[PDB]
């Protein structure tokens, strides 16, 4: 969900 993670 977080666009900066994975």
């Amino acid at each position, epitope marked *: 969900a*977080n666009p*900066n993670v994975d």
Partner: antibody
Amino acid sequence: QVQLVESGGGVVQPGRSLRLSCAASGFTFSSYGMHWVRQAPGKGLEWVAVIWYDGSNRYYADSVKGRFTISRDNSKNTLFLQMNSLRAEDTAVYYCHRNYYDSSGPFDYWGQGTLVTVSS
Amino acid sequence: DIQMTQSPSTLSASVGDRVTITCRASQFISRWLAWYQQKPGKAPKLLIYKASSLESGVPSRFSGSGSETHFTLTISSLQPDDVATYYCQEYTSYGRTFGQGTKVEIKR
């Protein structure tokens, strides 16, 4: 190694526009985003703007959204910030910045900063 | 617009003291909270990410805690080289928001 090199600082008269640039090397801008972050004389860090690798998801801080435009030129590996209607509050060191997290770990990069002074 | 509020604004203590900074987020941010260290005339350096994970090479006296809206950064034994300004930062979405910063100073 990833390197970010900012350019464009110096003195600029109020009301004018200025374009800063950040030449990136060591990676292709094909994932995540890139940011501008600024810091006025002895004040705190202020995130200014972001753009995604595909040119989308452009967002700005409220204080600057009405006057700034972020863009990128991948064929040059270069990030831009265009600041319009320059005013006293824009005097600051401007950093380009890249940050993301993946299974190899955190990745956090900053340019050296370039100082914009708005003055006659 | 998410607001990040750190406290205290300045923190003066002695070498060896345990010191803690708080950060409060005006919305739920899970654990997407980072902590940066900045020394004068330098670019900031990431110290802690996902609220409690340390960057490699960050000394073990640093630690972070919290979730959702209340977060802390602790230095368990303040050392001379820790004098710096410390910023919390949310990264829930495309942009970023920094706290106002905490200047850590040493009394000797």
